[model samples]
Structure formats: C-alpha cells, structure tokens
Target: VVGGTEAQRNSWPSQISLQYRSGSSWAHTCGGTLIRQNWVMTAAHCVDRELTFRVVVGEHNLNQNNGTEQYVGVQKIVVHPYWNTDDVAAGYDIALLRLAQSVTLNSYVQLGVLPRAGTILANNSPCYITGWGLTRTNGQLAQTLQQAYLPTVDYAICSSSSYWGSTVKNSMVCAGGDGVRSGCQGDSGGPLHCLVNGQYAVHGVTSFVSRLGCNVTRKPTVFTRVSAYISWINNVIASN
Candidate 1:
C-alpha cells in the first residue's frame, strides 16, 4: 500500500503472502485470501509465470521469523475459465489455489468470508485493503503487512470518464483513489474487507491500479468483485 500503517498481528487473519521460489530464496509475489482450510483466492495473473508457488498464512512480517506463518505448497491452481492471460480488461482475473494440506485455523489464521452472490455495496462504503505490497508507488515491499482504508467507489463514479472510464465494470469493485493510500505491486490478489452488517467479508480480490501511478486521483484500485463469482467459486470447490 502506498500510504498505510503496519497491521496488527492477527487483526487480518485471512491475509496471506503468495510466494514463488527464487535461486535459494522465495520472493513475495502477491497477496491472497484464505477461504477454505485448503483453498486460497488470488489473482490469475499471479501464477501465469508457471513457477513453483507457496502460500504463507498468518504472516505479519516478511523478513523475519514471525512464528505465526503457516507455509504450505500449492497443490492445484484453477484459473477462471473465461480468464484471458492477455486480457485483464476483459475481467475474470480471479483464481483458486488448492493447498497441499488443510491449514489449522486459529487466532493467527482463519478463513475469509465471501459475500453473497450478486450482492453489490453502496458507493463509498467502509472497507480496508491489506497486504505486503509496496509502501510507495515505485518502492520496495514493506517488511511488515500494511493496511489502508480504501472505501468502495461505486460503478457510476468509477466508470465515469474522470474515473476509470469504461474499464471499470460491474464485475470489478473500485476503491481508494485518494492519491495517497492504495494498493501497489505485490498487492494483487489481496483482500478488500468490506464491513457488511456486523461482520466483514472479502468483497474483492485486488486486481489492478492506474498505470499512471499506484495512487492516482480518481483512478482507484480495482479488484475482482467476489460477489460476482460466489456461485462459480463454490462450484469450482465442490467439483475440484
């Protein structure tokens, strides 16, 4: 996040770090949300490179041994059928990763709740985006997880010419274009936890930002609308 505060331990328990192996080390590639004990939700493009990947849950810090991290191998990856690797603008950027083993849920690690299918939030609703993304537009990833307040930007405003224009579809959710706090590189696939009723749910999968900058005015961070794919997600999990 461009402008965010270090997240408290276990505060956002469903948040996770998606990593790919390097020479002798693993690099944080993106953020993901733990849905089932053995299933994770992330951006399809995060695995397009075809590298060995792992999921780390309860990870508050990237550089040190936080002791809360639960590392697991990715057993299977299922990208949305209509997802075109070359066409993010076409939508369907969501993906599901089946874990090699079910993770034990606790205070530090838990499941992310998904919103009701086809549900839509009102404009400027309260929400928070959390991840290990960059602290600045072109800077390095933070040593610790960070979260920034990124309220919802309804379709009407987001699709306006002054906003994301035609690129903002109903399948996506727009948030936080305050030109200060927003998701950047490595934040893709993270959670947009929107408070609904009395509980919070993962309403979005962080997808993209303005090419002009990570925090561009009127060009809020875009995410795959989770509510748009609830049925598809459940079907994938049940069949796979």
Candidate 2:
C-alpha cells in the first residue's frame, strides 16, 4: 500500500496472502481475508487468470518463516456470476475460495468479522486498508504486510465528477483520495477494516485504484462493498 507502514503482526489476524505457484516457488498475487475456517473472500479479478492457487494464513512477512503460518490448497473458487472480467468498473468484483482443509485459529489466525448486509459507513468513517500490495505506484510488492488509514468517502461524493465519478458505484466503497496513502498494485482482494459499534469488521474487498497512480488526488481507492453481497456470500457458502 502506498504511504503505509508495516502492520503489527497481530493487528489483522484475518489478513492472508493469496499466492500462485510460479516455477518452483510460490508468488504472492493478492491479499484475502479468512471469512471462515476454510473460506476466503477476495476480488474476482485476482483469480481471473487460471493458475494453481494457495492461501497462507497468519502471514506477516513474505520472505520470512513465521511459524504461525498455515498453508492450504484452494479446493474450489466461486466468482460472482455477474462478474465480467472485461468490465471491472461495472462492479461485482468479489469472489470466494474454499480451502482444502479447515485451519485452526489462534491469536495470529482467525476469521474476519463481516459487516451486516446493506451496512454502509458514513462519509469520512475511519477505516484501514491492509495488504502486501506495492508501496508505490509502479513498485514491487512489500516483503511485509502494510496498512494505511483510509477513511470512507461516501457514494455521493465519490461518484461526483471530481472524484471517481460514476465509476464509483453504490456497490463499491471509496477511500483515501488524499494522494498520500492508498491501495496499489498487488493489494487487490485485500480487506478494508472499518470500526463499527466499537468493533472492527471487514467491509470491503480491495478492487481498484486510480490508473493515473496509486495515490492520486481525488481518485480514491475503490473496493467491492462486502455488505452488498452478504446474501450472495452466505448462499455460496451454504450451497457449496
């Protein structure tokens, strides 16, 4: 994440590294949240490319071995039916991955709390975006997880001509147009944790950033509003 700091190891336990096999090594592709013992929430675009995937929980550093890490193969992936790879701006960017086995939860690994269906944060609501995305617009991914405070920008303002315009829909949440901090490349599928009712919940799935730059002024980072798909999420989990 641009203008972010290395996150505290225990600050976001549900944060996970989504990776794909690259030759003899695994390459970190995107960030995801553990919504259940064996289910992960991510962006549909993150898995558009056909590749063998795996999920690593309790991961802090990508280059170091944190004994707390749990690696599991992805058993199945369910992309939103309405998701169109050619038109990400049209929304429906969320996806779910079922892990091969259930992971044990501890202080370093746990399920992420999700916002209630139809929940919407007020403008400027405090939130944090966490991921292993690039620290700069055109940079390499961070070795450690990073987090940046990105306040929510209500749909009305975000959809204004000066902001994301119509590209920022109600099904999406916009945050951090400050030109100082934002989600960048490799941060897709990450979580936007928003504090509500004295507790934090996963309210967004990092979807896109300004094409001009990672931290562009008035072009906030956009995410798939998780609450808007709570019903779809539950149905997928229940049926599959």
Candidate 3:
C-alpha cells in the first residue's frame, strides 16, 4: 500500500499471502482473507493466469519465515461467473479458493468475519487496507505486511465525474482518495477491514486502483463489496 506502515501480525489475523511457485521458490503475488479454515476470498484477477498457487496463513513478512505460518496448496478455485478479465470496471472481480488442508486457528491465524448481507458503511467510515503490496505506484512489494487507514467514499460521490465516475458501482466500495495512502500493485484480493459495532469484519476484497496511478487524486481504491455476494459465497462453498 502506498504511504502505509508495517502492520503487526496480530492486528489482522485473517490476512494471508497468496503466492505462486516462481522457479524454485514461491513469490507473493496478492493478498487474501481466510474466511474459513480451507476457504479464501480473493480477486478473480489474481488467479486469471494458470499457475501453481499456495497460501500462507499467519504471515507477517514475505521474505522471512514466520514460525506461525502455515503453507498449503490450493485445492480448487471458483471465480465469479460474470467476472470479465478485459472489463474489470464491470465489477464481479471476486473469487474463492479452497485450500488443500484446513489450517489450525491461533492468535496469528483465524477466520475473518464477514459483514451481514447487503451491509453498507456510512460515508467516511474508517477502514484499513492491509497487504504486502507495493509501497508506491511502480515500487517493489513490501517485505513485511503494511496497512493504511482509508475512509470510505459513498457511491454518490465516488461516481461523480471527477472521481471514479460510473466505474464505481454499488456492488463495490471505494476508499482513500487522499492521493497519498492507497492500495497498489500486489494488494489486490486483500481485505478491507472495517470496524462495525465495536468489531472488525471483512467487508471488501481489494479490486482495482486508478489506471492513472495507484494513489491518484479523486481515485480511491475500489473493492468488491463482500456483502453483495453472501449468497453466492454460500452456494459456492455448499455445492463444491
């Protein structure tokens, strides 16, 4: 994330590193949320390419071994049927991956609570975007996890001409247009943790950033609204 600070491991227990086998080693490609012991919520774009993927739970550093980490292969992946790779602006960028094995829950590894169906945060609601994404637009991914405080921007304002325009849909959440702190490359598929009723829930799956730049003025980070797909999520897990 641009203009973010290192995140504590315990701060976001559901956070995970989605990596792919790169030659002899695995490389972090995106972030995800552990919604279940064996299920992960991510962006469809993250798995668009055919590659061997694995997930690292309880990971705080990308380059170092965190003894608490649990690595597991992906068993199956289900991308939303309506997701179009050529047209991300059309929304439906979410996906779910079933892990090869269920992970053990601990202080550093736990399931992320999902927001109630159709829940929407008020304008400027406080939230945090956590990931191992880049620190700048064209920068390298952070070795350690990072987080930035991003306030939500309601649909009406985010859809304005100066903002994200019609590209910002009701099925999506927009946050952080400060042009300083925002999600960048490699952050997609991460969680947008929002505090609600004195508890934190996974409300968003990091979707897209502005084409102009990662942290552009009036172009906040966009996310797939998780609450919009509760039924789909349930159906996928049940039928699979």
lDDT of candidates 1 onward, in order: 0.94, 0.96, 0.95
Candidate 1 residue-wise lDDT at 111:
97
Clash pairs detected, candidate 3: none
For model 1, which pairs clash? none
Candidate 3 lDDT at 38 equals 94
Candidate 1's C-alpha runs over 4 A off are none
Kindly list the per-residue Cα lDDT of model 2 for residues 146-171, writing each as its tens digit. Answer: 99999999999999999988888899
Please give the lDDT score at residue 95 for candidate 1.
97
RMSD values for the candidates in order, in angstroms, are 0.6, 0.5, 0.6
Scored against the true structure, residue 100 in model 3 reaches a CA lDDT of 97
Q: What are the clash counts of all predictions, listed in order? A: 0, 0, 0
Q: Tell me, by lDDT, which candidate is best.
A: 2
Compose the digit string of candidate 1's lDDT tens values, residues 1-240: 989999888799999899999999999999999999999999998888989999999899899999888899999999999999888878898999999999999999999999999989999999999999988888999999999999999999999999998988899999999999999999999999999999999999999998898999998999999999999999999998
